[PDB]
Amino acid sequence: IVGGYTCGANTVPYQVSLNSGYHFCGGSLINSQWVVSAAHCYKSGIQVRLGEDNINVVEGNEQFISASKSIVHPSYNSNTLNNDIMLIKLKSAASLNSRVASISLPTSCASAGTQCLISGWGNTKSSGTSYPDVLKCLKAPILSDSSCKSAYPGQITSNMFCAGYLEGGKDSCQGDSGGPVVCSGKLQGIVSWGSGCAQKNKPGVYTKVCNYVSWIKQTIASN
Ligand SMILES: N=C(N)c1ccc(/N=N\Nc2ccc(C(=N)N)cc2)cc1
Ligand SMILES: [Ca+2]
Secondary structure (H helix, E strand, O other): OEOOEEOOOOOOOOEEEEEOOOEEEEEEEEEOOEEEEOHHHOOOOOEEEEOOOOOOOOOOOOEEEEEEEEEEOOOOEOOOOEOOOEEEEEOOOOOOEOOEOOOEOOOOOOOOOOEEEEEEOOOOOOOOOOOOOOOEEEEEEEOOHHHHHHHOOOOOOOOEEEEOOOOOOOEOOOOOOOOEEEEOOEEEEEEEEOOOOOEOOEOEEEEEHHHOHHHHHHHHHHO
């Protein structure tokens, strides 16, 4: 997260870190045994780390649970990032508590202007690189689809939405991928892609979770 702030320990209790020996993506706990992340976060050997604040220090609220199954969206296209969503089932149910909590799926879609919380352990610099140890947060509005498609001509699909600030300075970034965009208590977005980070007129692009609620629910129910 570039231009964000320190969330505060466990203030984003659905935020998970995907760990393959190191944090490589965020995700969101959607129930005790399921995380949603970006399909582009797919890899083998995922350990889901819940209750994390400082990802480099065991602070006492963590649960580390191995993925038992990853399910990349059937239509995920890695070239375009269309359908950049993946479900990860945990080998065992997370113990739910104030610091490890699921985030509600939308029952529809959010609108341009809705303020969302985007969070992650991604890069905090727009030029160069600095990785935070503690979870960073960003309040950002959903941008109109038109501004989104204007910022990224030919690349924005109906499964993507932009959020953030056309002026630059405030954005998600590498390392935030797969993590949540939560608007009005619902996971509306997954950190998906962008051009650089926090650059003028290059807002974050997020997987439009509301398009996937049927698939998420059906997939979870069947798995
Ligand atoms: N500007 C954003 N909102 C945003 C920008 C980039 C982003 N990147 N995610 N992942 C990502 C993963 C790997 C590389 C790499 N091969 N070096 C670069 C980026 C995730 C979000
Ligand atoms: Ca920790």
